[PDB]
Structure formats: structure tokens, C-alpha cells
């Protein structure tokens, strides 16, 4: 049996919650808070025997997987989403690892309010700018980062433009590529429905 | 093979430490050594074609490679000091995670000039705590993180206290299995070479 423990946000858990849903897998998502989060927090730390006393955790039977990123990497790899050769699956890693710079960035100034300008005006842009170009030198109606083949890196581009448009919209017009690329993720038969009819508001 | 950074640690030491763990042969590029480093890394940028405009690069032939963790990850399975099975790799990875947690804690106090107190008295032994019990884990009843052989996870583990050490020495005292574990990996003939040669010799 699997369960996804997390707080009732999209956050540091929503990438393993896309990469489940694309890969058609059923699973309990247990979101904290849906009474009193802080308490139930406390609760499950006493309760599971958690490596580093955060979440997501990722039960699988008796397993405790913690640190989202490993779990992502253990997914992509089990479901064959890694990439197709041993340069596409460091180049999927190295896309990804990308993700996280300027993830981190972006949840620094909408999670913890440092103001949003500099992110905005010098962050953004130029992240953007680099994911652009490694569309470009990948580049129908399809597109991906590493290979013919969707990997994980898609999926992280696209939740990482998500997150940050959920409070900044129109943060892709000057990006053609990538904006065709997370339309085309959006659109993915397994994908569409999720994305869709998720309650709404993460972080 | 060519490593690109500044002349520190940073972000390019652990893969610094996995070449001389590993006995591999590299040339160590360092910016700022011979002449303006914020010049040269501005030259680099417009000569190499790197992804993200960062350091480290490791660039193999015309092959450039970047991010560190990935690098790290992707040397680990070429010269199999990645899990010795599916289950032990994601174990190896999640302390490399975690290792990335409270190194990044650090670098905010060791090198951005932030609030030292938090760490040392919130973070740190927090931290050490958690290690010490994931050694413990491994070891059951009657060194390593993982398995019964090294892993880029144990190399990892012995940077960040490393690291630590050189402002904060000695923060092991409370936990004897990480103290056990890092003065194993310091005194592996490669290793306590390279960190010889590091403060010169
Ligand atoms: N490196 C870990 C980070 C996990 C983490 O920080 N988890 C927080 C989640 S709550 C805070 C928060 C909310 C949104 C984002 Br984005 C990042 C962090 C936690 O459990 N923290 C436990 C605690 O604070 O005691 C990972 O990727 O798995
Ligand atoms: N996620 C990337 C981060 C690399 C990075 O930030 N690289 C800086 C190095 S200089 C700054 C610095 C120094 C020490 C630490 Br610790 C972290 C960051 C850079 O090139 N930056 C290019 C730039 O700032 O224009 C990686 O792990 O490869």
C-alpha cells in the first residue's frame, strides 16, 4: 500500500503527486491539516520513524522513503522516465537539479515573503532564458528536454512554471518554447484530469 | 577530464574528493588564481557553453557537464560507489539530500554572512543527531551509511563535517559514530593525500 504524506499544500510534494498521476499509480494522499496540521505534524513524527523529521514521506508497505528529490529519482528510474541512456539520465538529473536553484528562489519570496522584484526582474528571466534554450537544442506538438522520450525533467519544468504562475501569470510570454512545453505537459492524457481537478492551493 | 571552479570548496569539493577517492586524473581549473577571478569567470561564461552560467563545470572532451549533485550522482554509478542494489541507491541519495539540508544551512552562516547561532544551536546538532542515528540503523545490532561498502553518501557526509570543521571544529564530540565514520574516510590513503596536498605539501 502506498501513502504520500505531506501538508495540505502542493509544495515539495506535488512533482511525486504529477509523476504518480502520469504514471497511472494509486495511492493515499494524506495531507495534514484537512484538522489541525500542527498537531497532526507532531503526531506523525512520534507515530513513523522518519529519517530527518520532515516531510514528504513516501510509505510504501513497511518502506519510509524521505527527501523529495530521491523519491523522484527512485520513481523515474523504477517507471523507465530517467531518460534512455546513461548521458540522458544525467542530463534529465542536471535539468532537474536546475529546477531546484530556481525553485528555491521562487519559494523563498512567495512562501517566505522576501520581496518578490528581485526574483521577478533578475531570477525569472534568465531561469527562463536558460530552460528556453535547452528546449531549443532539443527541438510537433511534442516537446522534451532530454531525448524523444518524457522524462522527469518535463515534468519538473512544468511544476516548477506552475507553481510560480499560480502567483505570477504571465510570467512565459517571451518564452515560445517553453510555453509550448508546459501547454503540452498540461495536455498529457494523464496529466489533464489531474491537474485540473486538484484542490487548489499549494506551496 | 577539466574541473572548472572559484579556488574554494564549495560547491566543487566533494567531487574533488570522489577524483581522489576514486584515483582518477583531472586537470583542477580555479578562477582567480593566476588573475581576476570575477574577470576570468566572465571570459569562461562567453568561451564555454554552460546551461545555467554556474560553476562547477566538468567538462569531459567537448562534453560539458554541470550541476554538482548530478555530476556526483552520475560519477557515482560510472565508478560504482552508488547502492549495491535498487533500494540502497535511493538510501545513498536521501542522505545525499539531507547533506545538501544542513550543507546549505551552513554555507547561509559560514559564507553569506547570516545568523551563526541558529545553526550551531537549532540546526547542527539537530542535524548531527540524525546522522549519527542513520548510522546507527545500518550497523543494527552487534562505519558506512549504506551497505557494507563506501558510497559518494559516506563522502558527502565527511565533506559537510569537513567543511564544517574549518570554521567550527570540533562539532563530532556527542557523536562518536560520525566521529568514528569521518576519521575512517579521512585516513583512506587517497583521501588523507589529497587533503595533505590541499593545505599544501
Ligand atoms: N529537502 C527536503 C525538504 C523537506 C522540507 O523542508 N519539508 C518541510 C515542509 S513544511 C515547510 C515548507 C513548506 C513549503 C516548502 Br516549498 C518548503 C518547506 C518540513 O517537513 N518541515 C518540518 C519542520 O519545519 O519542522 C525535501 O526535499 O524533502
Ligand atoms: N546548483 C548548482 C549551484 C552552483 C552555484 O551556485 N555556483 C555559483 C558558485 S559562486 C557563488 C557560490 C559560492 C559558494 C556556494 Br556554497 C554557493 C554559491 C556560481 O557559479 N554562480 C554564478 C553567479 O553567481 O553568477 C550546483 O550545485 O552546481
Same mark, same amino acid.
Not at 504529477?18 to 497532526?40: C, S, W
Not at 503526531?43 to 524521505?66: R, S
Not at 519570496?109 to 527562463?128: A, H, I, M, R, V
Not at 502567483?167 to 498540461?186: C, D, V
Given at each position: 500500500?502506498?501513502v504520500?504524506?505531506?501538508?495540505?499544500?502542493?509544495?515539495?510534494?506535488?512533482?511525486?503527486?504529477?509523476?504518480?498521476?502520469?504514471?497511472?499509480?494509486?495511492? *493515499?494522499?494524506?495531507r495534514?491539516? $484537512?484538522?489541525?496540521?500542527? $498537531?497532526?505534524?507532531? @503526531? /506523525?513524527?512520534?507515530?513513523?520513524?522518519? +529519517?530527518?523529521?520532515?516531510? #514528504?514521506?513516501?510509505?510504501?508497505?513497511?518502506?519510509?522513503?524521505?527527501?523529495?528529490?530521491?523519491?523522484?529519482?527512485?520513481?523515474?528510474?523504477?517507471?523507465?522516465?530517467?531518460? !534512455?541512456?546513461?548521458? =540522458? !539520465?544525467?542530463? %534529465?538529473?542536471?535539468?532537474?537539479?536546475?529546477?531546484?536553484?530556481?525553485?528555491?528562489?521562487? &519559494? @523563498?519570496?512567495?512562501?517566505?515573503?522576501?520581496?518578490? *522584484?528581485? /526574483?521577478?526582474?533578475?531570477?525569472? +528571466?534568465?531561469?527562463?532564458?536558460?530552460?528556453?534554450?535547452?528546449l531549443?537544442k532539443?527541438?510537433?506538438?511534442?516537446?522534451?528536454? $532530454?531525448? =524523444?522520450?518524457l522524462?522527469? %525533467?518535463?515534468?519538473?519544468?512544468?511544476?516548477?512554471?506552475?507553481?510560480? !504562475?499560480?502567483?505570477? #501569470?504571465?510570467?512565459?510570454? =517571451? /518564452? +515560445?518554447?517553453?510555453?509550448?512545453? @508546459?501547454?503540452?505537459i498540461?495536455?498529457? #492524457? &494523464?496529466?489533464?484530469?489531474?491537474?485540473? @481537478?486538484?484542490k487548489?492551493?499549494?506551496?
Amino acid at each position: 500500500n502506498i501513502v504520500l504524506y505531506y501538508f495540505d499544500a502542493r509544495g515539495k510534494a506535488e512533482l511525486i503527486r504529477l509523476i504518480f498521476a502520469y504514471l497511472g499509480i494509486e495511492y *493515499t494522499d494524506k495531507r495534514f491539516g $484537512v484538522g489541525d496540521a500542527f $498537531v497532526e505534524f507532531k @503526531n /506523525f513524527k512520534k507515530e513513523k520513524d522518519t +529519517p530527518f523529521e520532515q516531510v #514528504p514521506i513516501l510509505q510504501i508497505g513497511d518502506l519510509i522513503l524521505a527527501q523529495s528529490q530521491a523519491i523522484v529519482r527512485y520513481l523515474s528510474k523504477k517507471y523507465n522516465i530517467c531518460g !534512455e541512456s546513461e548521458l =540522458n !539520465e544525467f542530463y %534529465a538529473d542536471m535539468i532537474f537539479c536546475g529546477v531546484q536553484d530556481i525553485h528555491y528562489k521562487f &519559494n @523563498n519570496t512567495n512562501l517566505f515573503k522576501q520581496n518578490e *522584484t528581485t /526574483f521577478l526582474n533578475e531570477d525569472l +528571466p534568465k531561469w527562463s532564458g536558460y530552460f528556453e534554450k535547452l528546449l531549443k537544442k532539443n527541438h510537433n506538438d511534442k516537446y522534451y528536454f $532530454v531525448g =524523444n522520450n518524457l522524462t522527469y %525533467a518535463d515534468l519538473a519544468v512544468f511544476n516548477l512554471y506552475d507553481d510560480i !504562475e499560480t502567483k505570477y #501569470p504571465s510570467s512565459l510570454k =517571451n /518564452f +515560445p518554447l517553453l510555453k509550448a512545453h @508546459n501547454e503540452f505537459i498540461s495536455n498529457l #492524457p &494523464n496529466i489533464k484530469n489531474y491537474i485540473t @481537478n486538484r484542490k487548489e492551493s499549494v506551496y
